[PDB]
Amino acid sequence: MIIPVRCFSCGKVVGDKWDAYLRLLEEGKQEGDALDELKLKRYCCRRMVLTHVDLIEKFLRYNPLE
């Protein structure tokens, strides 16, 4: 839905890295290199960011009901 604040396995904070990760992916860096630069070294932290699916963009398209 939206990026989790912590890594499930160990608890590192990954919620402040999704935008930097998207900007790194925009300028051409491949996913492993972007995850390296964000200093995600354990594969648990890495799969937190690499496998996230951002569904809030799809939920936001339905008009505010108030």
């Binding site: 939206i2 604040v5 904070v13 919620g15 402040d16 809030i56 008009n63 505010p64």
Partner: peptide, 13 residues
């Protein structure tokens, strides 16, 4: 730093 992402808001939300 901008901190952690908490939520997202649209029109009038």
């Amino acid at each position: 730093d901008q901190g952690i992402l908490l939520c997202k808001l649209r029109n009038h939300q």
